[PDB]
Amino acid sequence: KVQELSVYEINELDRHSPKILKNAFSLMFGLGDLVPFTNKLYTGDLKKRVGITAGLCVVIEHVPEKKGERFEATYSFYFGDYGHLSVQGPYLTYEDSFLAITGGAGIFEGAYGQVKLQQLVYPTKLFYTFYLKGLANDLPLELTGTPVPPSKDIEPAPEAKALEPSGVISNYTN
Template identity: 65%
Template sequence: MAASSFALRSTISSGIISNPRSKTLLPAVNSSFKPIKNPSLTQTHKLFTFSAPKRAFTCKSQAIPSDNSAPDKVQELHIYEMNERDRGSPAYLRLSKKSVNSLGDLVPFSNKMYRGDLEKRIGITAGICILIEHKPEMKGDRYEAIFSFYFGDYGHIAVQGPYLTYQ
């Protein structure tokens, strides 16, 4: 079973999202998300597993900036994203009909998300990767990925960006 974890921080009262790897606080009211780097796609035992983002996303507020940059209360939510391999995910769809990975091949996937204590399921991730470039000399591929994190009552985050299987 593949598992990965990352922290999502948000505030109750002031609408701030904090990057857990830096001490920068970013306003989150009416915000749009821009991913810096997306999860990497790794291959193990002829099945693909996905890991959480290695870098956090940036958040640019469209609201009026506030003079108070420190949040009143911060909640930290630790989650695990797991592929339990119970739904045939991910599937590699060779639309090119070639034996090697080729431009346009698709990899749809879905994973489950659990709280940090692994006691309660809090959501799912779902998305698709499109093969952009096959690099046999680097023993990997470059994909463009579009996927969403559905956190149930906590909300939803959609991200897009490159997957590199050779780094």
């Protein structure tokens, strides 16, 4: 059985991220370029800060026909004391994609399946829907509030941005 889990990834530009290592044959992004990154992670309902994303985008090619890039991404999603989910697969700056769920820890131990990545605002706002299989238990309620429908205009709740107790999960990852 699938448990859907949605999250918002936001680059608030206060984590030194992205760091672009530019090595390619080309002026534009190309093979050789590496982009270590880490962004903030909020619940799908945008009410709470949960943690961070962390990992590496490997540039594969520039896609001039689509005015964008293909990356191959290896990274994790951190949910404070709940644990983390890890993923591998395509990040395309110009369209939605699906990544493999490579595993998890904590409540996410045994996780498998795929996750849909939707870019909302390039490069600062992304929305994910994990189609989670293999979990030992029902996901905690504070993570499964009805998601805010994805649009360019979404914002984390002000109390979550401000890191107030009501706007964070316990020991949210930073």
